[PDB]
Design a protein around this ligand. Structure first.
Ligand SMILES: [Ca+2]
Ligand SMILES: [Ca+2]
Ligand SMILES: [Ca+2]
Lengths: 159, 157, 169
């Protein structure tokens, strides 16, 4: 008999929770940032070298974006919209293994589908950073870290 | 009594629907798209020829935008903000038509052209773009010119 | 107790009514902001901003703003300065800074009072420098709180419009 009121309060409370999330996302997207599945992304307007871009991303409480899933890869290459963007792709260690600067473990197995066919070709033996280039799932290219490009920052949505 | 309870019930499910709808819009706008009156719009950062622009829209499950109302025309010219954008205008005969198969209204469209256009300059201007910062915004240009472009796709919850 | 059960139940129903109506109000605010943001504008703390895509002279930039029911943006706080320079993304944008000719004081085109004290820390070090006795306008230039440069008003830059969010209630 009273179970009705309890349930109303409940829907209202869940409604409240969703309004809170949308609001938080809106305040951020309102400031020229993008948003996708738990993360905020910034697509720069000015080109930088890989490291200056990273340094910039850090100054905005984020990192050059990592890619952790196929849906994220697809969001990135689609939002990139034909323009080329530095991402968190960079060689580290004494092995020249690829890595994410934000320290996401690099998924070798899954990443295979994310490279432009033929890349990374390490041209000139001087291509130790990665960018998003092609308008396809197979989007990544290795390029010299000192070349300037637009870049993409990423930081997690946190209540 | 129950009378006023199902009232709260109703208004509550109505907001839920309203909130869901705002989320749908937020999600797409969060991916760099625009929204206006039941349609999503994409104003590109990259310029392309008309043909390549359309392929680009198709690959995003949309089409170069049509224009169905002065209201839409105003949203488009304002948002273009002084830049030139390919839209879904193309010849087919040679009558003008919308690439998304929206029926082209000669009469309504008469008002949307820049004064003096379509001038078919060089006799090779078979595509349309938004150029002037006003309701009279469209110019016809050669399909091979490379301009920014605008995609359109319906909002569906 | 049957009397207390009635009281409680009622106060709770009145409460739900209060909240449901408040929520409706908050969805409307969400919708106001969303509609404008969905249209290429930005939003920050009670104000909408337009970061232009096309460059203009200072006077022509202001003119455009007026046509979109706004003005070249003023800077009223550190928080707004930071929002502006960070959102500028490294690009140069005209703002509402304007000097009354030679030896004139600096003012805001939207009539916001100019805080000579505060403003000191918003200029790039060394500005305003009036290079050429020509620079009667201000722009956001450097990616820092010390961001402002004075430049000749006939230079063409991208520009930033600003207008208050006034709820449609
Ligand atoms: Ca390469
Ligand atoms: Ca023409
Ligand atoms: Ca100066």
């Amino acid at each position: 008999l009273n179970t009705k009121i309890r349930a109303l309060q409940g829907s209202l409370e869940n409604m409240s929770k969703l309004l809170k999330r949308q609001n938080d996302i809106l305040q951020v997207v309102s400031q020229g940032w993008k948003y996708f599945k738990g993360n905020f992304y910034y697509f720069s307007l000015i080109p930088k070298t890989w490291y200056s871009a990273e340094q910039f991303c850090v100054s905005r409480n984020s990192h050059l974006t990592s890619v952790t899933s196929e849906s994220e890869q697809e969001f990135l290459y689609k939002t990139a919209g034909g323009l080329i963007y530095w991402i968190g792709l960079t060689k580290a260690g004494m092995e020249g293994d690829w890595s994410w600067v934000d320290d996401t473990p690099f998924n070798k197995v899954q990443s295979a589908r994310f490279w432009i066919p033929g890349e990374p070709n390490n041209a000139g033996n001087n291509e130790h950073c990665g960018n998003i280039k092609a308008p396809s799932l197979q989007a990544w290219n290795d390029a010299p870290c000192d070349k300037t490009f637009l870049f993409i920052c990423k930081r997690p949505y946190v209540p």
